[PDB]
């Protein structure tokens, strides 16, 4: 059935854009991961690399 999606429709009938992002963890190495270190570089200091 139809939408219409008029600006004169109610709040229950206005067009809303929805992304339902989903994930699955198979027996494969992970691919969608955030930036791991991504901070900065130093040198010649007693530091934990």
Partner 1 sequence: FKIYSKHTPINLERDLPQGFSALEPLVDLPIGINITRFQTLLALHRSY
Query: What is the smallest separation between the CB atom of 12 and partner 1, expressed in angstroms?
Result: 44
Q: Is 20 in the site for partner 1 (CB under 8 A)?
A: no
Q: Is 25 in the site for partner 1 (CB under 8 A)?
A: no
Dist CA 21 CA 32 (whole Å)? 12
3-state per-residue secondary structure call for the chain:
CCCCCCCCCCCCCCCCCCCCCCCCCCCCCCCCCCCCCCCCCCCCCCCCC
Query: What is the smallest separation between the CB atom of 28 and partner 1, expressed in angstroms?
Result: 5
Q: Is 33 in the site for partner 1 (CB under 8 A)?
A: no
Q: Is 28 in the site for partner 1 (CB under 8 A)?
A: yes
């Amino acid at each position: 059935q139809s939408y219409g999606f008029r600006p004169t429709y109610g709040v229950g009938h206005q067009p809303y854009r929805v992304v339902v992002l989903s994930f699955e963890l198979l027996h494969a190495p992970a691919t969608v991961c955030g930036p791991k270190k991504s901070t900065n570089l130093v040198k010649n200091k007693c530091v934990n690399f």
